[PDB]
């Protein structure tokens, strides 16, 4: 493996199913090369905002490590996957640092994730005691006691379950349709550069 390999970006952008945003998936990309032209010359993307790197320039740069974070969110919630943004997703589900270096890629996935009758497999976290630190993942499903009475592990009056389904139907508005999101994090540290363009 320590001898010139192709970065397995396929199992990220092209996976059959994505993870819910509260349990966002992360794959570490290391020691490999990739032709980023196939990425920035693709028209299948509705959001391709880069921060700190020029998109069309990814083949001319090398990086120590690359992190690909992937999940599914609502359409109107895509704008929160950006440095300095706040909201339900940025505060409680997935948060980018103010100094983020990388690109935020998103495309409509109603054809892949919506079902007549509603697809409720994708969820998000409604609340959290404090906002998420950058690149922090919270998968806790503990029922919160917001009242006087102990909850004993069941939903109730002031006994809330921290996660809720999205409810994806094919007839929802675009702003309410599922969108698949990939967050590429390029790390240029003091280590030797491994993930290069070509």
């Amino acid at each position, epitope marked *: 493996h320590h001898h010139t390999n*192709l970065c397995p970006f*396929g199992e990220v952008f*092209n996976a059959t199913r994505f993870a819910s945003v509260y349990a966002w998936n992360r794959k570490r990309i290391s020691n490999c090369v990739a032709d980023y032209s196939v990425l920035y010359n693709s028209a299948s993307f509705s959001t391709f905002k880069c921060y700190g790197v020029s998109p069309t320039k990814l083949n001319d740069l090398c990086f120590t490590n690359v992190y690909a974070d992937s999940f599914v969110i609502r359409g109107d919630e895509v704008r929160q996957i950006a440095p300095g943004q706040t909201g339900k997703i940025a505060d409680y589900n997935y948060k980018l640092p103010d100094d983020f270096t990388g690109c935020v890629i998103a495309w409509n996935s109603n054809n892949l994730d919506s079902k007549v009758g509603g697809n409720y497999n994708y969820r998000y976290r409604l609340f959290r005691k404090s906002n998420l630190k950058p690149f922090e993942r919270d998968i806790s499903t503990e029922i919160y006691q917001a009242g006087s009475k102990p909850c004993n592990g069941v939903e109730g009056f002031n006994c809330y379950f921290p996660l809720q389904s999205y409810g994806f139907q094919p007839t929802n508005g675009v702003g309410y349709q599922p969108y698949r999101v990939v967050v590429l994090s390029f790390e240029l540290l003091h280590a030797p550069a491994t993930v290069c363009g*070509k």
Partner: antibody
Amino acid sequence: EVQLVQSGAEVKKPGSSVKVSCKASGGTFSSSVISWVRQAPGQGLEWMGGIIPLFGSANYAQKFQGRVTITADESTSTAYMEMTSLRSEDTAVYYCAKVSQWALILFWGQGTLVTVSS
Amino acid sequence: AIRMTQSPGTLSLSPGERATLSCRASQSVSSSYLAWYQQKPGQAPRLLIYGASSRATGIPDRFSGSGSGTDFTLTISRLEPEDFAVYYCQQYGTSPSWTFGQGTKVEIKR
């Protein structure tokens, strides 16, 4: 857009060699794993080997390590499979299969019939 | 080398039944690089499933792939006349190192 086009069917006599081509279009050529799959009549699918055009480092199955050579030409986006010392047991259909590093789907050619006899 | 052994060799069922085909791996295989193919006689292999569970273009919903690690499963919820064929599973990846299963023939019952 992506499409694999292999060369026409051939008839080789025993002892000779054959070099099957595989023309790819769509730009995903250099950043792909392009393999060659063989199917003898009445048998299953058999993976012979593959190569990554960016590196040119081909890998081969043990059964085909000796008489099979797989090359790649990034200038024309064409893969080649050359088998020497052809025997009647090498009569089969030969497919070039390709996986782009940006997807999990497999791209196949239409196959090439090689009949070995005199 | 990784070995893909399918089970059963032959599957004798009637139209309308549920087909359950097995693909066993000698090592743990990433579910992102497993495929299923349908082959009718005299035809090139038809890519059914890629990435363990993604359906290729035009494949009906009655074909579903599943599994992980070493046990992978192709299920046909209701067999049509056109589905009786031979089915192969393939391990692959981003490296030139792929293997195929020996295949499973789905034929009709009498």
